[PDB]
Amino acid sequence: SNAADKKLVVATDTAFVPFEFKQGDIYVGFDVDLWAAIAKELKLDYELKPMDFSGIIPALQTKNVDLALAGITICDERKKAIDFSDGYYKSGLLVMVKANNNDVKSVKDLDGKVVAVKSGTGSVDYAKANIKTKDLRQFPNIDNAYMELGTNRADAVLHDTPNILYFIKTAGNGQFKAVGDSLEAQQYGIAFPKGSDELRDKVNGALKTLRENGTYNEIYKKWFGTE
Ligand code: NA
Structure with missing residues (x-):
């Protein structure tokens, strides 16, 4: 050789x-x-x-x-x-909702709700503009925003489609589903x-x-x- x-x-x-x-x-x-x-x-x-x-x-x-x-x-x-x-890989922003949330299906069904985002993400702008939220919970770490959804203190979370998915799978065990399609899509x-x-x-x-x-x-x- x-x-x-x-x-x-x-x-x-x-x-x-x-x-x-x-x-x-x-x-x-x-x-x-x-x-x-x-x-x-x-x-x-x-x-x-x-x-x-x-x-x-x-x-x-x-x-x-x-x-x-x-x-x-x-x-x-x-x-x-x-x-x-x-x-x-298809990049973009996805929306996590408690699986038992059969009311929300997309980002437009969020008008007048609570959406948890992370500081320094592109989730903020899309929401600051394309979305009409009654409250934007800008947390410095998504892990805590996940808690808010788990405590129904928020209606859904907005973050990178990759990340939202990994968690839906890792330590997800239900009570967490994805709705709609990757927004602001990109490619890796x-x-x-x-x-x-x-x-x-x-x-x-x-x-x-x-x-x-x-x-x-x-x-x-x-x-x-x-x-
Ligand atoms: Na619940």
Whole structure:
């Protein structure tokens, strides 16, 4: 076998649930599983390099890294320094309601209710504008906003569709459902250095295949649950 080993350098954020987080002395998450599955098909060898989002692109610029799979969302401004592949996840804001809440079904059914959000999120603006709330409970951590819904001190919560789902699944055990569809949708994608080009198209085809194959659904169930 000698040293024909692929020097592919992969990079992720130190802490970022539920995509790349440390659990059981091993980084775990959706993005890790995705790159593992892609590799199987592409038959390439990877070496995850953990760093702060601050240096992810800066590094890709000098190609100190050859690929990066964090929560990089497709953005044309950034394309001046890097290049993205077809997205692997639909981002956006979702609405959690107690499962027994069969009255609310969407964000427009919230006019005149209590919606819990987190400070420094995009949930605030959408609500400050597209929504007519009798009260906006801006908490500094969603965990507490989840309590409010659990104590029916709020009618529903508004936060990233990924997060709301992980919890509906992890420590959800009912009394928590999702309604409607992801608002302000975006797409998450792998980021390849400008120099790399075929490696990109190769990975693009790989993702088309795995989504064509559809094992993504099972991985989706493991993290974000049933679509
Ligand atoms: Na209740």
